[PDB]
């Protein structure tokens with residue numbers, strides 16, 4: 107059960123993500139980015155964008171197939187809900203949002219500490235496929251710092267692009283609207 111899983115992750119977060127230090131905070135980004143890379147290596151995505159948003163929200167966008175939304179056999183819930191309510195990133199985020207572009211439709215769900223706040227809802231239409239995940243790390247868990255280091259993200263994003271040639275991976279810092287930094291990596 108999903109609620110018992112959320113309890114277990116939040117009780118011993120370091121056993122899942124290594125630590126709750128600044129290292130563990132950045133690990134949240136890598137968990138999400140690794141899923142986008144998996145989708146690229148499977149043959150379905152080639153562009154990943156990581157944005158550090160105002161108040162240290164992280165937004166990760168990919169142009170994969172979109173996390174499936176079909177009503178699943180096990181849970182009787184949309185697949186995306188099942189997948190995200192078992193995500194360690196969701197459990198350790200005070201807030202998380204997903205937008206799935208799939209079936210020419212945009213689907214949205216939001217969560218707090220892993221708990222869905224409402225049922226998956228159709229919010230719009232689209233001519234693309236892919237997934238947007240936005241999350242705010244839980245300061246109750248990450249007690250040292252919740253502020254991302256641009257250089258730390260940049261170094262690993264550049265490395266990921268070099269290791270997975272053909273994937274365009276972009277990093278953008280929007281925390282200061284007057285001074286926005288972007289680096290874009292695409293190895294050939």
Ligand SMILES: Nc1nc2ccccc2[nH]1
Nearest residue numbers: 138141142145170173237
């Ligand atoms: N593309 C993608 N990104 C994801 C993030 C969390 C769970 C599944 C995912 N699939």
Ligand SMILES: [Mg+2]
Nearest residue numbers: 137140141144
């Ligand atoms: Mg994964």
